[PDB]
């Protein structure tokens, strides 16, 4: 029931963000929500090439680092890498089949594209700091610590994808498949999308930001300056990505775009709150392990932990959630020098 | 069964291009086939921004056009728009879910992205040459002549997509869904995939080039210089795209990748041939609509048809197919200037 070109003539201004008629013509002269067109414009204007950044000196810097510090840096890098591997593909595979307005369709493809550039930049960095990149790459997949911090990300995307598949194939209803009963509900599928988006929002809003702090800590010490420039370029893109997810959720919860979504949003509030807290926790936990055999110069488990509570608070309010943590001022205001945005 | 992040640590250098384990880590330090990495690098180096292109004068030229030239012009542009609309999402929705090597996964995404840019350029052109783009865009969807020419593009993709879903949900075998027997053969999916690519190859390699010739006819008349600028940037992308499909197809036939794929290519050669013959003819049939109100000096049905055979033959030989048409030299050697 999915089509690469819906032959029905339709007003693309009146379609909902998701689950309406698949987009046929790709036009950009008009939009139901211009924020999406603005996002495409800004992301294109931000286009950059990793190779164009010199990382010549990070190698010796990396190598002179104290062992515990090498670990901190590389684990963090490994984490960023995983996240972007997932982000390069997932929004395209997960959202495209359910988008009904073109500006959003294209924003998603542009956003996903920008994530591949991020992946490209990681290879660039790794290549220039270790002897055998394969050692780093191979550890991303099975690193117990990583799948542990990242746990649940692929699963939200994977379930939505499968549900989407059943929906498109079988349509809404109570069906049977090889002797088993399989129920398909548009409502359950909207829930899944909603929680999946909320989760990607955390991913962009919190997970990455925590990593930015771990990377910029080195920059503050004039260390890994190649990596730093890349991270800076990456953080500028994330702000945009963050903006898209926030608007999507806000338009969804606000009931303007899809009433049922507004409803749904309300019913899983507590569910979302918990999801958020869970993510803030994983990050804390990661932090607790990355700084066990030694803390770094200007960052430690406790500072990082405060940061996570700090930014989590801001992100959650930005999406109408209650604050889970004690309100406090930024505990590492020096980071603002790197977050050009 | 599909996964956004496969947990098995796997040698990505040994997976097949398609149907292997979904790519987990995105690494570009090595590649099974470097031609894909090379394509990503070139496309990136070719990044361009449409709006930046000056089309301030295209409206003047365009308005001053004889009614039929306008029609020729717009009908053509509307077709390009339809194709880029499909090519912006298609590769991502149809292929992404079946790729098993990172360099190919990223190439597909860059490629698709490159197409959204092609689409943004058309809006840029449109919005600047007509008073209400809605007429154009609305027309793209309903224009029977246009759909007739594009017939079978969205269908291959849609078919492949659907079988893919079954495959991912049910896995291979004969199943019972809602009391009906549904068969899921991977070999059969592989054929859908293979023919889909062959069709995209025809789309990138022939359908777009004929469209370029039409666009460029105007440039040669010193008219529509903004469009022309854009068409050249686009042609430059299209050359990388078909290089990409030719390579996929040729690598598959070689037997160097999934052996089952090479048997399929051999087994399906007539289908391959028949689809190019059918695409060529659609491009030929379009002339009747294109030239409804009259032709232009140097651009007519005949020229058009001769160009179609000329180029189709070049393409088919590029992927090892027999040539259906009578050999000939380029009927429009002047297009070379723009194509480079
Ligand atoms: Fe990223
Ligand atoms: Fe991002
Ligand atoms: Fe294109
Ligand atoms: Fe193309
Ligand atoms: Hg999601
Ligand atoms: Hg998700
Ligand atoms: Hg941190
Ligand atoms: Hg750190
Ligand atoms: Hg929720
Ligand atoms: Hg949430
Ligand atoms: Hg295809
Ligand atoms: Hg296709
Ligand atoms: Hg032509
Ligand atoms: Hg066949
Ligand atoms: Hg063939
Ligand atoms: Hg001919």
General description of the model:
Chain B: It catalyses: a 2'-deoxyribonucleoside 5'-diphosphate + [thioredoxin]-disulfide + H2O = a ribonucleoside 5'-diphosphate + [thioredoxin]-dithiol. Chain B: Pfam families: Ribonuc_red_sm. Chain B: Its EC number is 1.17.4.1. Two copies of one chain form a homodimer. Chain A is mostly helical and 341 residues long. Chain A has one domain: Orthogonal Bundle (Ribonucleotide Reductase, subunit A), CATH 1.10.620. Chain A has twelve helices and two strands. Chain A has a two-stranded antiparallel sheet with strand order 1-2. In chain A, strand 1 and strand 2 form a beta hairpin. The longest helix of chain A is centred in the middle third of the chain and has 35 residues. The relative contact order of chain A is 0.13. The interface between A and B is large, with 70 and 71 residues. Bound molecules: fe (iii) ion (FE) (4 copies) and mercury (II) ion (HG) (12 copies). The site of one mercury (II) ion (HG) has 4 residues of chain B, from helix 10. The site of one mercury (II) ion has 4 residues of chain A, from helix 11.
